[PDB]
From Swiss-Prot:
Disulfide bonds: none annotated. The chain holds residues 7 to 123 of 256 of the full protein. It comes from the Bacteria. This is Small ribosomal subunit protein uS2. Belongs to the universal ribosomal protein uS2 family. It comes from Thermus thermophilus (strain ATCC 27634 / DSM 579 / HB8). Part of the 30S ribosomal subunit. Contacts protein S8 and may contact the N-terminus of Era. Spans the head-body hinge region of the 30S subunit. Is loosely associated with the 30S subunit.
Amino acid sequence: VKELLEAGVHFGHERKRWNPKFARYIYAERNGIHIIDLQKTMEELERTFRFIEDLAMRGGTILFVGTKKQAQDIVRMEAERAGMPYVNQRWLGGMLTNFKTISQRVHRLEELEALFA
RNA sequence: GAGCCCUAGCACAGGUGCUGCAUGGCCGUCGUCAGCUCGUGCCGUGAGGUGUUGGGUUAAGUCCCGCAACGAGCGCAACCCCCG
Ligand SMILES: [Mg+2]
Ligand SMILES: [Mg+2]
């Protein structure tokens, strides 16, 4: 239901293209490829989802980010489907640290929206 | 008696005499070449860098694509005149 739904095909990826700080999450090497251990994915999903839940049930807002082409279409769907914002194409330099300045273009976007009709 | 005009005296005028390395103003010139910058972010101990390195395209930093940058300004172009 959980970790049987995950073993679906939704774990193990890379192949000694690894960052060795991620060893605490790794189970073994099946066939040249690192197999991430789901019994510990279990663990972090509970902790992360606890933190997400909390966040939501108090007016919290979560910027979803994923630009790589496998996730592009997923992140937009799920993001619209929660009314949270998403970054999908390029992540622009300073969307956060320069948010003051980048927003000024959201304000331009809507003011150009306003010359549609 | 005030304009006004000559005589002498007083202040002063006059100087195309010097310095264009004391200057203003205006002009030439590189060059109508495609450049030169800024605000915030980010990188760097720092000068500084990114933006404005790359690929394409244009008469052009013109436009596109890309990208720790997102924008903007002086330029380019347009707004002006002539010719068709
Ligand atoms: Mg001079
Ligand atoms: Mg001389």
